[PDB]
């Protein structure tokens, strides 16, 4: 597991030189944005169980055959497993937002998630539909200017949007 600072340390550890004085200015620009980072995470971790169930409900109206009798997410054993499966993806996306780099997203979550949907028979294209349902709810809640000073945060919600559509192309 790395954070954003660890990928600059461990890169030049393989090159073996000291960290340059123009690379410190890139790390100090990150800690100036370090407190706008912490309320993108606090906005999405607090409405976490309503990002999930409002995105599942939007999925099951577009593709109604996933919940009809003989469908994949039909029973009450497997509706709960489908609802869990978006909670785990939203968990590791917010983990990779607070670290700054995606090295824990594709390690404990996406490392072979595609190959276990071929074994389970789960439609992997429909999990990537319901991740982009959750991307549209989470970047709208990271623009919420209540209890926070007004400023430009467009470069950090575009990084949160990057970890959502990385986990969508890794299941199809």
């Amino acid at each position: 597991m790395l954070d954003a600072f660890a990928k600059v340390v461990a890169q030049a550890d393989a090159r073996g030189e000291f960290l340059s004085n123009t690379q410190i200015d890139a790390l100090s620009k990150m800690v100036k944005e370090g407190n706008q980072r912490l309320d993108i995470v606090n906005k999405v971790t607090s409405n976490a169980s309503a990002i999930v169930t409002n995105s599942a409900r939007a999925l099951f109206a577009e593709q109604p055959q996933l919940i009809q009798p003989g469908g994949n997410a039909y029973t009450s054993r497997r509706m709960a497993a489908c609802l869990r499966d978006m909670e785990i993806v939203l968990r590791y996306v917010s983990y990779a937002m607070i670290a700054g780099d995606s090295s824990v997203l594709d390690d404990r979550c996406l490392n072979g998630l595609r190959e276990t949907y071929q074994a389970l028979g789960t439609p992997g294209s429909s999990v990537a539909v319901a991740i982009q349902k959750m991307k549209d709810a989470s970047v709208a809640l990271a623009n919420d200017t209540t209890g926070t000073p007004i400023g430009d945060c467009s470069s950090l919600v575009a990084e949160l949007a990057g970890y959502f559509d990385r986990a969508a192309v890794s299941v199809v």
């Binding site: 055959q65 949907y117 439609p123």
Partner: protein, 160 residues
Amino acid sequence: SIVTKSIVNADAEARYLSPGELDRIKSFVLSGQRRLRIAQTLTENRERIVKQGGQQLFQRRPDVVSPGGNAYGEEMTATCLRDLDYYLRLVTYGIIAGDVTPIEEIGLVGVKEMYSALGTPISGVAEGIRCMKDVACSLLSGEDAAEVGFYFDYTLAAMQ
């Protein structure tokens, strides 16, 4: 197109084009402004026309997507929608050519040999194009829906 087979018709007959042929090449090119608008509607609606096209296709033919169906799994279902994107594209060619000549020699000539040789139910793919037709004609007015739907049902006729 209407221009090329009105020529090859009068070509075979050792003659030039009659007023009946030249008052329609004339009538077709003045129709050309309205044709590009119609094809322009279907051009950037392929996301909905195809995806909702395969919507009703699976609800009406769950066998083809069920285990044992030809389009079963994540793989075949993607190709299951790929063919609908093909046939939706050829209808845009037929609308601009003013004839099913583009649809004739692409996707229609010998189509039963392909789908029979692929194991695909040819009646099933005919059901898919009909589902796309209701989505397409729902995107246009009545004067246009008599055309865009008009090319689909020709494809329905030749596909069975």
